[PDB]
Amino acid sequence: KTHVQLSLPVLQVRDVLVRGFGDSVEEVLSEARQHLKDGTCGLVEVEKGVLPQLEQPYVFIKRSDAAPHGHVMVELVAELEGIQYGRSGETLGVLVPHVGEIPVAYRKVLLRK
Length: 113
Prior knowledge:
It is a single chain. By secondary structure, the chain is mostly beta strands. It has a single domain, classed as SH3 type barrels (Roll). Helix content is 12%, strand content 40%. It contains 1 helix and 7 strands, in the order E-H-E-E-E-E-E-E. Strands 1, 2, 3, 4, 5, 6 and 7 form a 7-stranded mixed beta sheet that branches. A hairpin with an 8-residue loop joins strand 3 and strand 4. The termini are close together. Residues 1-113 are annotated as: Disordered.
C-alpha cells in the first residue's frame, strides 16, 4: 500500500530518551520509515524551544493534502543546518524513536510510504 494508517504516540520533549534517528539526512529518513513500520516511532509537537533540545538532522511529518477515517495525510521532510530535503505542508511535529516513554496523546496519520 502507498499509504498506511498509523496512530503515533505524542511525547513531551523532556521525556524523550533518544533525541534523533542518526547522523545524515538519508539515515534519519531511513530510520524514521523503519520505526514507523515497526510501531517504534513517537511524535513531538514543535513549539518555541523544542527543536534545540533534539538532535539534527530532524525528521518532520508535514500535511500532504487537505483526512481519511480521522487520519491526516502526511509525508516525511528532513532538515539539516536550515536546509530541508522534501517539500510539503504544515508541520504536525518532529519524529523521534519511541523506547517506552508515556505519551500525552495520539496523532492519527495516513503516512505516504
